[PDB]
Symmetry: D2
Subunit: 344 residues, 4 copies
C-alpha cells in the first residue's frame, strides 16, 4: 500500500541547523538520487557555512567544489540558499520547494516545537535528528522503519547511542530473550560541552567542564527510551555515559541478564547472523579512530564479548562501536530517503 | 577595599582565588548569567588550576567561602548592576563583552561602582598597565584602566629588557598559545565571524591574530610601531609561550642576552635555565618566565637576528599580574 | 627510620618518593633505573600531571640532593647486581614493570642486597596481594616478597567488599574507563608485548584492553573468588580513572541504601562524595578509591535487580598512596 | 618494474608502502622490522591519523598478502644480515631511524643484499640530500646511499628557494610548530636519547626541541648555506605541522609580491592556498609543502623589513609523498 516514489522523483529537503549532523547529512545526500537540499537555515552568513562544509576536522575535506555566492553557496555548480532565521515559524521553506525539513539545531526536538516548521509557505514534514519525545514515532533504520506509513508530520531519527544500541539489543531479544540490562556508552565529547570550564547554559555541572581534558559522566535516555524502538524491551534497560577526549567516535557496552543460557560463541554468532547495512560485525581488535566515518549505525565487536557464569547465573556483556557523527548520519539519511519515498 | 567581579569565568574565578591571599582587597559581589550553584561548583573544581583551597557552600542568592557570604546576581547589563549595595568600589570587568572605555563606564552610575579594571585590552584611550613594567603611570584618579592581555604581560618585560640593554629596531612575535573559551569545542559557526576559531580548538593547530606586539606602545612608548605578530593556538587547555625574533641596535651574544634578562628578573619577570615544558608553568605567579635555553643569536655577514622566548600561563600568570595591578590601584585610589 | 630503595624511578617510583617525604620513619637512600642522575632529577622536579616538586632538587656526582639530603642513583639493569645494603636499604619498591613475580623480585634479596620487596603491581598467585585498609591484616612480617596489587584492584576492592559485607554479591562485571599509561605507544607502532590495541596512539583513541582486577579479586577478598570479571576502556587523559561495577546482589536494595553503605565504609583509603566531579578533580588524591554516589543505579525489572556502583581513582596518586601505606606498615612489622 | 624493500615498517615505512600501491613501476617485495607479520598487517590495515587501508590485507606464513599479492616479512635486527636479493630487491627504504648515516645505511649493500639505499631522514653531510622538485637534478643514478631529507626540510626548501630566487635572502630564523612524534614519551619518563624535553608527555605539553632543517639547508640549496637557523615547538596533535620563517631580504617587498612569487613557484610538491585552514585540513595531503598566503607578513620600520612566510606540511604524508617521488625517480635513472 505504500506506493513509494522512484529515486528519479526528486524530493527537495531543507536543513535547519547546519552543524555536525546537518553538514554530514548534506554530504551523504550528495550520493542519494531522489533527495536534494535546496535550503539551509542557521544563524550565520553563507561564507561561514561554506567554509565549514569544505573543511572538516574529523570527517575530512569535502568531496567536491564549494563556492560562496550572494545569499548562499554553490556545491558542484548547484546553488543552495542560506538564511539566518532564528524562529522556525518565520522560515519560508516552500519558496525553495522544500517538503521535508531535517531539524538539526538541537533546540526544536519535540512535536510542538518541530511543528513550527509546518505552516503556510513552510514545510510539510519534519525529521528531528534527535530523540523527539514519547509521542513522536522514533525510527532506527533496519530495526523498525516499517512503523512508518508516510502520513506522519513529525518523526524522530533517535539518538546516536539508540542507533548503536537498538540492533544489538534486538539481536539479544530475538535469540535469547532479555530480562534486564544496564548500558554504559564511552562517548566522544560533543558540542553541548564547554571547551574549558565555564557556566553551562543548560545547568549541567559536568558538561560545564573542559570536554577535551576530562572523563565526564553524563546522562542519556537511550536505554530508558528503548521501548519506542523495540516495544518488547520497554522499561527493561537503563544507562549512562562517560564522555572522553576524542572529537568523534564512541562505543556502547550493555551488561544484561538473558532468559536463555549462552556461550560467548553463540552470542557472537547471533550478532553475525543479524548483520546488514546498519548493523556491522567485526572480530578485528580495532580502536575508536578505526570507526570514524563508517556507514554502519552500529558495529558489533566480537573481541569484547563476555559471558560470566557463577552458580548457574549468567551476566552477558555485548559491545558495539559507532561514530556518533557519521554512523548516526548514515542512519538518519537512510530514514529520510525512505520517508521521502513513501511521504503522503 | 571591596571589589566586584563581572564575569566569573576563567580570569574572574582565578582572580577571586588570588584575592583570598591579598589583605587590601576582598570580593563582596559576583555578577554573571547563571545561578549560585553553577558558580560555586566552578570555583570548587578547576580542570587546570586544581581544587579550591578552602570551603565553598551554596546559599540563597550567593555562596559562602570559608564562612564568608558573597552575593551572586545574574544581570546581563552593566548599567543595571547595583554594585554599591555590597560596598563595591572597584569592578573587575572580566566578561570579555565590555572591553572599552564607553562599555566599562556603564558600571559607574548612581548605586554602581566608582572604578573599573578591564581584564583585557581596552582601547588606546584607557591606561594599559603591565605590573612591574609601567604601573607607575597610574595616579589613582582614573575611572577605567586596562590590565592588558596575557600575551602583553608576557612580552612586555622581555621586550623592555631588550630595549633598555641593546635597543630594538624591529621584531616579529609568534605566541604558541593554549586554546581558550572563544574557540569552538568542535567545528561550528563562530559568532565573531572567525573561520579559524570556528574549528575544534583541542584537535588543531589554529593560526589567529593578536594585538599584543602591534599595541606594545601603550605599555612601552619607545617600541611604538616597531613590532607585529600573530598566534598559533594549540591543544593544551592552559599554558603558552611567546617567541620574539628581533633586530637590535647593538651586537650581542646568547650569553649577554640571557644575563640581561636575569638582571631584569623580579616578582613579575622570572628567569630559568631548566629545559621545561608548558605543564611546568601552569599556575605560576610570574607574568612572564624567560627561558634561557631557547635563546638564539644568528650572525650572518655582520648582521644579527636575535630570538628571545618567555613562558606564561595565560590563566594564572595574567591573573597574578591583574591582581597586583588591582591591589596597587585600590591602595592609591 | 626504615631505609627504602626504589627500582624503576617511573610514574609510581617518583610519586612514591614524593609521598615518602611526608612519612616520618621511612626514607629513600637508593634509586636504581637505566639512566643518569640528571634525567631522574629533572623528572622528579617537573611533573606533567602531578605538578612541580615541593622542595629543592640538585644534581650531584652519582645521585642528587633533595632538600640538602643526598640520594644515590645507579643504572643497574639486573636486580641481582644491585648492592642495596651499601646504602642501608632493607626494603625495595620494585616498580620497573619487568620483575613482577616471586622469582624475579627475589633477585633483589642476596648478599649485600635487600631483605624484602614490595612489587608495585600484581605479582602472581603465590605472592600475598595487599590493598591497604581492605586486607593488610594478612601480613605477619615474615614475607620476603609482597604485591601492592594494581591501581584498579585498589579502586575496586573496598567498593566490592562494601557490597559483599552489607548485601552479598552473587556475580558482577567491571568496566574501568582508564587513563592511558606508559605501556601504550604514543603513535601507531609495533607493540613489544604483542598487543594490537596498545600498539595504537594512546592519546588519540578509545582503546579496549584487558585487566585482571575483577578476575583476581579472590586474592584480596576471598569470599568474592570467581564471582567477578571485567575489562578496560583506555581513553585520552594522561592520568585519572574510574571503575564501574554492575552486580547482582543477594538482598534487594535502593540507591539510598547502597550510597549509605559506602559512606559507612569510608576511611583513609575509601572516600565518599556526592559532588558531580570529573577526572581532573581526582588527580593527586590520597584515597585509593573515591565512591561517587551521583552515579549509583538500581534497576528493578519484574522483581529482579541490577546494581551499578562507580568509584574514581587517580591510577597514579591513589595507587601510590595505598602502596606507601602498605610499604610503611610492612616495614614496621618486618621480622 | 623495480622491486623495493622497506627496513622499518613504521609511520614513514607503512605510508610509503601505501603510496607505492598507486605507483606503476615500483613494488614492495620485502619488509623488515622487529615483529611478526600479524602486528605489521594490523598496523597497515588500521591507521589512527591516515585512515583504513584501501585494499585487502591477509596474514600468511612469513608475511602477508595485499590484494592477493604476497609480501615477505622478516625480523632481522642487523642490516648486514638481511638477504634483500632473495626477493629481487634492488633499492631499500631505510626508515627505522637507527641507520641514518652513510656507513650504517651501506650495511644493506653486500652479496645477496640491496644495490642502493634511500634513507628516510637526514643522512649526514657526505650523502646527497634530495627534496623532490627542488634539487632532485643532483642525482645521476650512480649513488649507493641518498637521503630524502627531513619532513621540515621538504616543507622549508621550496619556500626558502622561492625567496632566494626572487628576492635574495640575507638570513632567517625558523620555528616549526610540529605534531608530536614517536621519539617522544607517551608519559613523563627516562628518554633513551638523553633529551629532557622529549622525556615529557608528548600529547599533553608544548615541548621545545631542536631541529637541523634550517642549519643544514645548504645541502639542498647551496646558496643558503649557513644563512638560516631554527628550532621547533612540538604540540598535541598526532600528525600535521607548520613552518614559519622570519627573514631579511636583499630586496624590498610587499605581502602581495611575496605571495605572487610563491604562487608562481607552485607545483606537485609546493602547494599554494589562500583559505584560512588549520592542521587537520593538511593531514594526508600529497604536497611536500603548502604555502599559506593568509599568514604572510612584511613589517617595515624605518626603511628596514622583516618578512614572515608560513607553509603547512603533514610531517607524515607530505614527507612520504616527496620520499616516494624521489624513490620513483631514483629507481628509473639507476
Ligand atoms: N553530534 C553528535 O554526535 C550527534 C549525534 C546524534 C544526534 N545529534 C543531535 O543532532 C542535533 C545537532 O547536534 P550537532 O552535534 O550537530 O550540533 P551543532 O552545535 O554542531 O549544530 C547545531 C547548529 O544549529 C544552529 N542553530 C542553533 N540554534 C538555531 C536556530 N534557532 N535556528 C537555526 N539554526 C540554529 C547552530 O548555529 C549550529 O550550526 C542535536 O539535536 C543533537 O542531539 C548529535
Ligand atoms: N583565558 C585567558 O587566557 C585570558 C587571559 C587574559 C585575558 N583574558 C580576557 O579576560 C576576559 C575573560 O576571558 P575568560 O577566558 O575568562 O572568559 P570566560 O568565557 O571563561 O569567562 C566569561 C564569563 O563572563 C560571563 N558573561 C558573559 N556575558 C556576560 C554578561 N553580559 N554579564 C555578566 N557575565 C557575563 C560568562 O557567563 C562567563 O562566566 C576576556 O576579555 C579575555 O580576553 C583571558
Ligand atoms: N602508571 C600507573 O597508573 C600504575 C598504577 C599502578 C601500578 N602500576 C605498575 O607500576 C609499574 C611501573 O609502572 P609505571 O607507570 O611507573 O611505568 P614507567 O614506565 O613510568 O616506569 C618504569 C621505570 O622503570 C625503569 N626500568 C625499566 N627497566 C628497568 C630495569 N631493568 N632496571 C631498572 N629500572 C628499569 C624505566 O626506565 C622507568 O623509569 C608497573 O608494574 C605498572 O603496572 C602503574
Ligand atoms: N614521523 C615523521 O613525522 C617523520 C617525518 C620525516 C622523517 N621521519 C624519519 O623517518 C624515520 C622513521 O620515523 P617514524 O616516525 O616512521 O618512526 P617509527 O618509530 O614509527 O618507525 C620505526 C620502525 O622501525 C622499526 N625498527 C627499529 N629498529 C629496527 C631495526 N634495528 N631493524 C628493523 N626495524 C627496526 C620499529 O619497529 C618501527 O616499526 C626516522 O629516521 C625519522 O626521523 C619521520
Ligand atoms: Mg542527492
Ligand atoms: Mg582578601
Ligand atoms: Mg620520610
Ligand atoms: Mg606499485
Amino acid at each position: 500500500g505504500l506506493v513509494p516514489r522512484g529515486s528519479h522523483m526528486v524530493v527537495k529537503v531543507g536543513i535547519n541547523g547546519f552543524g555536525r549532523i546537518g553538514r554530514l547529512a548534506f554530504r551523504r545526500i550528495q550520493n542519494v538520487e531522489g533527495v536534494e537540499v535546496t535550503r539551509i537555515n542557521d544563524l550565520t552568513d553563507p561564507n561561514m557555512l561554506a567554509h565549514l562544509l569544505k573543511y572538516d576536522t574529523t570527517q575530512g575535506r569535502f568531496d567536491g567544489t564549494v563556492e560562496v555566492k550572494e545569499g548562499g553557496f554553490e556545491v558542484n555548480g548547484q546553488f543552495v540558499k542560506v538564511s539566518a532565521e532564528r524562529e522556525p515559524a518565520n522560515i519560508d521553506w516552500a519558496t525553495d520547494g522544500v517538503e521535508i525539513v531535517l531539524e538539526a539545531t538541537g533546540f526544536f526536538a519535540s512535536k510542538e516545537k518541530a511543528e513550527q516548521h509546518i505552516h503556510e509557505n513552510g514545510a510539510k514534514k519534519v525529521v528531528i535528528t534527535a530523540p523527539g519525545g514519547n509521542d513522536v514515532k522514533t525510527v532506527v533504520f533496519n530495526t523498525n522503519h516499517d512503523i512508518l506509513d508516510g502520513t506522519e508530520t513529525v518523526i524522530s531519527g533517535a539518538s546516536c547511542t539508540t542507533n548503536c544500541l537498538a540492533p544489538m539489543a534486538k539481536a539479544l531479544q530475538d535469540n535469547f530473550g532479555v530480562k534486564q540490562g544496564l548500558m554504559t556508552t564511552i562517548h566522544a565529547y560533543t558540542g553541548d560541552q564547554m571547551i574549558l570550564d565555564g557556566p553551562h547554559r543548560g545547568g549541567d555541572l559536568r558538561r560545564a567542564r573542559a570536554g577535551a581534558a576530562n572523563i565526564v559522566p553524563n546522562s542519556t535516555g537511550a536505554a530508558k527510551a528503548i521501548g519506542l524502538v523495540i516495544p518488547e524491551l520497554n522499561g527493561k534497560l537503563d544507562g549512562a555515559a562517560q564522555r572522553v577526549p576524542v572529537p568523534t567516535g564512541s562505543v556502547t557496552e550493555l551488561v544484561a541478564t538473558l532468559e536463555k543460557d549462552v556461550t560467548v560463541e553463540e552470542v557472537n554468532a547471533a550478532m553475525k547472523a543479524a548483520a546488514n547495512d546498519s548493523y556491522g560485525y567485526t572480530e578485528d581488535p580495532i580502536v575508536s579512530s578505526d570507526i570514524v566515518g563508517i556507514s554502519y549505525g552500529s558495529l558489533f565487536d566480537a573481541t569484547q564479548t563476555k559471558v560470566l557464569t557463577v552458580d548457574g547465573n549468567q551476566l552477558v556483556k555485548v559491545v558495539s562501536w559507532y561514530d556518533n557523527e557519521m554512523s548516526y548520519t548514515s542512519q538518519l539519511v537512510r530514514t529520510l530517503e525512505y520517508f521521502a519515498k513513501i511521504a503522503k
